[PDB]
Amino acid sequence: QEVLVQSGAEVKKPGASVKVSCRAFGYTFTGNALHWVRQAPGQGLEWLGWINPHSGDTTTSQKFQGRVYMTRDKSINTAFLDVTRLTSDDTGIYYCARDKYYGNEAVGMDVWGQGTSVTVSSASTKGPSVFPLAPSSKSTSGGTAALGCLVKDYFPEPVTVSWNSGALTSGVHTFPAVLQSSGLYSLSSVVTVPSSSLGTQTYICNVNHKPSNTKVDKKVEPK
Amino acid sequence: DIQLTQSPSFLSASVGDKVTITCRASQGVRNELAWYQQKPGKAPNLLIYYASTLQSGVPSRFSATGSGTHFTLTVSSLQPEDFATYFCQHMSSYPLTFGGGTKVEIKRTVAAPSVFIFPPSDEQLKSGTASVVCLLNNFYPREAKVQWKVDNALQSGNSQESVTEQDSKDSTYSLSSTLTLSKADYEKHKVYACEVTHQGLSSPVTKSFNRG
């Protein structure tokens, strides 16, 4: 029954601030302390602080004092996290998490919000250029060929990729995006298909970058 | 700050195995320690609190022991849903800190990568940059070395790798390496090769093309 619902993804410039919200459902909001915990891409868990929603009292990790502020609004069962003076070191997924709080002390984080993605970057919104990864003219006769789509120079995360409007899902590998030195993201999506199907079967990748309203279909054919 | 060191950082096991993860605190924390499970793209889920009490609804194949500085988490018989990363966390003093995590992967037989190389497309070459992609498909274990050579010159600092999570079906990994050059630099040179080293290969495999 206990559920924490967080606000949506944020994209901020260096030096800006961000306010993430976290509304408690299914239990008495003022009955449990609430933590804020963040996770940078591919990194571990880092504790920011916690708040008593009954009294509004807080404890903030020394690393984030002067920069992080925790508040709450009882009337809407919502706790807020303010993070100011953002840098790219603050990019990551931010969680609120309830503590079991037995005996008014920390015991364990038993309910977690879904997380709020915060991206801190100078880059501006940009749809991707989609290029074909053409199946080589050296395909194994009766074996397996490989083809794909390069989804390059977009911001911010995320993009989705499907193949043949979702009809092809076997042998598909859509790689996690990397952050290029330019500050734009890039990824590839590939699939292994029978070499006898080239020319015969049509292979199209569907790229969706909702942050910029970019929907690209690129046909991938041998050269 | 109390630092929590977890061992090992990475673990390979099979369904049905018994595995034990260790968390050592740099200071004593009494029983004030919790364990968590986390899967890619998901929030952590609480497993253990008071160092050894199971959280409501956690399967009984999880158990944990420890007091002071030395703590262990045990899965009695790993099931497919148990392959994930596990964290310890203390709450004896500020700041609350987590261990670095222990990733539990599926064990399988050695599988060499299938290797493919992709020259940049003509359309991209108009934009002024060339992206060369090398694909390592469905290999195991995850350790692999990829190196780029352009006219027999080793490339450094101009490539980025990306790797998938372990495949749910065949338990393999796949990896991409992307070489990025200015269209100008791409034009001078002729031979483009990615050299792949992996324990499933008798010796390193090179795939290559000549520009044009």
Binding site: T30, G31, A33, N52, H54, A106 | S92, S93, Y94
Partner: peptide
């Protein structure tokens, strides 16, 4: 362990 004082019981 650390704590933040009383909360609303019920």
């Amino acid at each position: 362990a650390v704590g933040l004082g009383a909360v609303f019981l019920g």
